[PDB]
Design an enzyme around this catalytic site. Structure first.
Site, PDB file in Angstrom:
ATOM      1  CG  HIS A 126      -2.528   1.977  -2.435  1.00 34.47           C
ATOM      2  ND1 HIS A 126      -3.393   1.396  -3.338  1.00 34.47           N
ATOM      3  CD2 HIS A 126      -1.763   0.972  -1.948  1.00 34.47           C
ATOM      4  CE1 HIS A 126      -3.146   0.100  -3.408  1.00 34.47           C
ATOM      5  NE2 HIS A 126      -2.160  -0.184  -2.575  1.00 34.47           N
ATOM      6  N   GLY A 168       2.070  -6.444  -2.776  1.00 35.94           N
ATOM      7  CA  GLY A 168       2.961  -5.917  -3.797  1.00 35.94           C
ATOM      8  C   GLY A 168       2.487  -6.148  -5.225  1.00 35.94           C
TER       9      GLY A 168
HETATM   10  C1  LIG Z   1     -13.206   2.792  -2.588  1.00 38.56           C
HETATM   11  O1  LIG Z   1     -12.182   2.033  -3.220  1.00 38.56           O
HETATM   12  C2  LIG Z   1     -10.906   1.901  -2.736  1.00 38.56           C
HETATM   13  C3  LIG Z   1     -10.373   0.642  -2.480  1.00 38.56           C
HETATM   14  C4  LIG Z   1      -9.074   0.504  -1.998  1.00 38.56           C
HETATM   15  C5  LIG Z   1      -8.283   1.622  -1.767  1.00 38.56           C
HETATM   16  C6  LIG Z   1      -6.977   1.508  -1.281  1.00 38.56           C
HETATM   17  O2  LIG Z   1      -6.432   0.273  -1.031  1.00 38.56           O
HETATM   18  C7  LIG Z   1      -5.188   0.005  -0.381  1.00 38.56           C
HETATM   19  C8  LIG Z   1      -5.203  -1.427   0.147  1.00 38.56           C
HETATM   20  C9  LIG Z   1      -5.884  -1.550   1.514  1.00 38.56           C
HETATM   21  C10 LIG Z   1      -4.640  -2.337   1.859  1.00 38.56           C
HETATM   22  C11 LIG Z   1      -4.953  -3.830   2.004  1.00 38.56           C
HETATM   23  O3  LIG Z   1      -5.462  -4.385   1.051  1.00 38.56           O
HETATM   24  N1  LIG Z   1      -4.685  -4.586   3.137  1.00 38.56           N
HETATM   25  C12 LIG Z   1      -4.075  -4.067   4.372  1.00 38.56           C
HETATM   26  C13 LIG Z   1      -5.002  -6.021   3.228  1.00 38.56           C
HETATM   27  C14 LIG Z   1      -3.759  -6.922   3.171  1.00 38.56           C
HETATM   28  C15 LIG Z   1      -2.910  -6.646   1.932  1.00 38.56           C
HETATM   29  C16 LIG Z   1      -3.658  -7.116   0.687  1.00 38.56           C
HETATM   30  C17 LIG Z   1      -2.674  -7.444  -0.403  1.00 38.56           C
HETATM   31  C18 LIG Z   1      -2.527  -6.726  -1.536  1.00 38.56           C
HETATM   32  C19 LIG Z   1      -3.330  -5.465  -1.900  1.00 38.56           C
HETATM   33  C20 LIG Z   1      -3.559  -4.934  -3.320  1.00 38.56           C
HETATM   34  C21 LIG Z   1      -2.839  -4.092  -2.232  1.00 38.56           C
HETATM   35  C22 LIG Z   1      -1.329  -3.956  -2.378  1.00 38.56           C
HETATM   36  O4  LIG Z   1      -0.687  -4.885  -2.833  1.00 38.56           O
HETATM   37  N2  LIG Z   1      -0.676  -2.786  -2.059  1.00 38.56           N
HETATM   38  S1  LIG Z   1       0.940  -2.783  -2.311  1.00 38.56           S
HETATM   39  O5  LIG Z   1       1.239  -3.142  -3.678  1.00 38.56           O
HETATM   40  O6  LIG Z   1       1.539  -3.741  -1.426  1.00 38.56           O
HETATM   41  C23 LIG Z   1       1.576  -1.132  -1.972  1.00 38.56           C
HETATM   42  C24 LIG Z   1       1.391  -0.660  -0.529  1.00 38.56           C
HETATM   43  C25 LIG Z   1       1.793  -0.164  -3.080  1.00 38.56           C
HETATM   44  C26 LIG Z   1       3.007  -0.955  -2.465  1.00 38.56           C
HETATM   45  N3  LIG Z   1      -3.536  -2.972  -1.562  1.00 38.56           N
HETATM   46  C27 LIG Z   1      -3.331  -2.864  -0.199  1.00 38.56           C
HETATM   47  O7  LIG Z   1      -2.608  -3.661   0.340  1.00 38.56           O
HETATM   48  N4  LIG Z   1      -3.904  -1.940   0.645  1.00 38.56           N
HETATM   49  C28 LIG Z   1      -6.235   2.660  -1.060  1.00 38.56           C
HETATM   50  C29 LIG Z   1      -6.783   3.900  -1.305  1.00 38.56           C
HETATM   51  C30 LIG Z   1      -5.984   5.104  -1.084  1.00 38.56           C
HETATM   52  N5  LIG Z   1      -4.917   5.263  -0.276  1.00 38.56           N
HETATM   53  C31 LIG Z   1      -4.415   6.522  -0.355  1.00 38.56           C
HETATM   54  C32 LIG Z   1      -3.089   6.932   0.270  1.00 38.56           C
HETATM   55  C33 LIG Z   1      -3.323   7.783   1.523  1.00 38.56           C
HETATM   56  C34 LIG Z   1      -2.154   5.749   0.564  1.00 38.56           C
HETATM   57  C35 LIG Z   1      -5.122   7.342  -1.207  1.00 38.56           C
HETATM   58  S2  LIG Z   1      -6.288   6.463  -1.849  1.00 38.56           S
HETATM   59  N6  LIG Z   1      -8.070   4.008  -1.790  1.00 38.56           N
HETATM   60  C36 LIG Z   1      -8.824   2.882  -2.020  1.00 38.56           C
HETATM   61  C37 LIG Z   1     -10.117   3.022  -2.504  1.00 38.56           C
END
Ligand SMILES: COc1ccc2c(OC[C@@H]3C[C@H]4C(=O)N(C)CCCC/C=C\[C@@H]5C[C@@]5(C(=O)NS(=O)(=O)C5(C)CC5)NC(=O)N34)cc(-c3nc(C(C)C)cs3)nc2c1
Ligand SMILES: COc1ccc2c(OC[C@@H]3C[C@H]4C(=O)N(C)CCCC/C=C\[C@@H]5C[C@@]5(C(=O)NS(=O)(=O)C5(C)CC5)NC(=O)N34)cc(-c3nc(C(C)C)cs3)nc2c1
Ligand SMILES: COc1ccc2c(OC[C@@H]3C[C@H]4C(=O)N(C)CCCC/C=C\[C@@H]5C[C@@]5(C(=O)NS(=O)(=O)C5(C)CC5)NC(=O)N34)cc(-c3nc(C(C)C)cs3)nc2c1
Ligand SMILES: [Cl-]
Ligand SMILES: [Cl-]
Ligand SMILES: [Cl-]
Ligand SMILES: [Cl-]
Ligand SMILES: [Zn+2]
Ligand SMILES: [Zn+2]
Ligand SMILES: [Zn+2]
Lengths: 195, 194, 195
Positions: free
Chosen positions: A56, A136
């Site tokens: 992601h 991040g």
């Molecule tokens: C079943 O297990 C999981 C389990 C999770 C899955 C998943 O998690 C993505 C998670 C959900 C969302 C989130 O946690 N919140 C809104 C809560 C507040 C923020 C929490 C703070 C930090 C979090 C670690 C983090 C992060 O730092 N991201 S980041 O670095 O800033 C960045 C965008 C790359 C720049 N992750 C993240 O923020 N986000 C995605 C997908 C997939 N997404 C895709 C595409 C379409 C984008 C394909 S797969 N899969 C999954 C599967």
């Protein structure tokens, strides 16, 4: 035991061009590489000579390397997990084998955040922080007290903008992706040294 | 009484170089500055000559100035607060003394959102809006009805993508901070008040 | 589903930046859903009846880069989060839905076709929830009925714990109520072809 500090090596300019050319001849150092596409930044953790980060953030994108762009060796959208051949010079973490429930998440700002493992791919922060402390840091490592990799940071559970618990891809899920296998590039814009 | 409008002054390219060089020879104007690293954007409010903003946006970065980059004069991580010497040209807000609970939050888009204070560092929107109204307005001011700085926007309580209440560093915590004591952050725009 | 999609990137960040500054996009336009960008954020736009619609919270009152220079907004509705431009030559246009189906399909910037159950005038539920990341950056994307006709555009999501369960959209009706009543340019950096 576990401490960390960051080192920025590029600006957004270097990043943009590195992304376009897919050709990064900067010297790779540390176990955790601060990583970025031109438009978003996150972490990539190294385990078993493979450089692992989240899908992601990375997508199916290649990694800018010394002899040009490196294609993803592993890709698991269902587990939100990708991995490149680790570039020359990059240090690799060893997988945890002690079974400790006391985990330590390392962030992009080199903070070491205590976590208690309460599930195979999930654990609670011992003291909640504003979600900004974590955002991040995806693809960053969770470490046991001996500093071995247990899994990489994937998501967090929050309420009212305060993160109370985390979700990670365990190190076993990597072994399973590894066995099961058998325009812009992602760019290293910094690193996080451990000890 | 309170009104405000915005003015952009830089593109991302402009911002990128100004960040790396650390030299901003543009004319600084206004009480609130639209500020950005090369990779994220927020606000900075000037009070009593100090140009304040949030650590969660600016980290411990310097501020690009007309005679080179300016180092943070204050840095309070626990409060999510950083301050620089206000660059020449900037106008400065004066702290509020009237103790009013009727606050008004100014956004990066220049919307003046009414907020009722309900705690030292905490207040409620009189009418909720989508979180997108506020996102990117950290470091922005909360103002008493007479247009004085009561605090600085820091975080928001939201559900289902709608913001209901806010969290802000009070202007007193800044006085406590003041007492106790690669790239530069760049001004890419500003917000004029009245 | 009879509905499937894939995306094509047409610009990068440097390409996007310049084109934003100039407001002149001479790239050949194709498909119904356009991947769209200011220099600093990215979302989607959907064409319906010659009008290229997107979200205000992404585009604001920005001009759209055009082949003969920048295109001023034809419609602006901040109450509904809606903006629209004349669809530039090349852009194919979807048709408003009339079947009144509640089995909707959200199309995302990553070309995922997500099932949704319409449960209100301007609101729906995902048949199987996903991590919020699946939706983020897809505002202004199309919600389609089984026939691939537009019912509305993606506006917001209801989420908890990082999982998106329901979505909020502008109905196609509200656009016809806008049509009767009424520095940088936004730039197309890719597209999504449907079928
Ligand atoms: C079943 O297990 C999981 C389990 C999770 C899955 C998943 O998690 C993505 C998670 C959900 C969302 C989130 O946690 N919140 C809104 C809560 C507040 C923020 C929490 C703070 C930090 C979090 C670690 C983090 C992060 O730092 N991201 S980041 O670095 O800033 C960045 C965008 C790359 C720049 N992750 C993240 O923020 N986000 C995605 C997908 C997939 N997404 C895709 C595409 C379409 C984008 C394909 S797969 N899969 C999954 C599967
Ligand atoms: C005790 O009081 C507080 C109290 C709060 C503290 C804190 O608040 C950070 C807050 C928590 C999170 C948040 O509110 N939500 C997820 C809810 C939805 C969004 C609501 C919309 C707008 C919000 C104002 C806003 C904002 O616009 N930010 S921003 O400008 O867009 C930007 C990313 C910088 C570019 N603030 C913000 O979004 N975020 C951080 C830290 C510290 N973090 C660190 C580092 C590691 C990042 C050091 S300190 N401290 C604190 C302390
Ligand atoms: C009454 O109906 C609505 C109803 C809603 C309204 C509204 O909602 C915007 C919504 C609320 C917020 C949100 O849902 N979450 C934080 C939850 C987690 C994310 C859910 C994932 C994806 C969501 C579709 C999406 C999105 O992908 N956006 S995006 O592409 O990434 C991008 C930032 C533009 C680059 N939209 C979005 O994320 N956001 C805003 C406004 C207006 N905003 C403005 C200005 C001030 C910015 C004017 S109007 N209006 C409204 C009206
Ligand atoms: Cl929310
Ligand atoms: Cl480019
Ligand atoms: Cl996908
Ligand atoms: Cl996300
Ligand atoms: Zn161990
Ligand atoms: Zn006052
Ligand atoms: Zn239909």
């Amino acid at each position: 035991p576990i401490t960390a500090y960051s080192q920025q090596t590029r600006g957004l300019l270097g990043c943009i061009i590195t992304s376009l050319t897919g050709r990064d001849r900067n010297q790779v150092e540390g176990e955790v590489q601060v990583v970025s596409t031109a438009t978003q930044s996150f972490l990539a953790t190294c385990v078993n000579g493979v450089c692992w980060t989240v899908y992601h953030g990375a997508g199916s994108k290649t990694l800018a390397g010394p002899k040009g762009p490196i294609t993803q060796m592993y890709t698991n959208v269902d587990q939100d997990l990708v991995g490149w051949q680790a570039p020359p010079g990059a240090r690799s973490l060893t997988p945890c084998t002690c079974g400790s429930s006391d985990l330590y998440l390392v962030t992009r700002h080199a903070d070491v955040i205590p976590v208690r493992r309460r599930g195979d791919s999930r654990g609670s922060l011992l003291s909640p922080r504003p979600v900004s402390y974590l955002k991040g840091s995806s693809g960053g490592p969770l470490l046991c007290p001996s500093g071995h990799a247990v899994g990489i940071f994937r998501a967090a559970v929050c309420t009212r903008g305060v993160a109370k618990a985390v979700d990670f891809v365990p190190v076993e899920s990597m072994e399973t992706t590894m066995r099961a296998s058998k325009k812009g590039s992602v760019v290293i814009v910094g690193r996080i040294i451990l000890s």
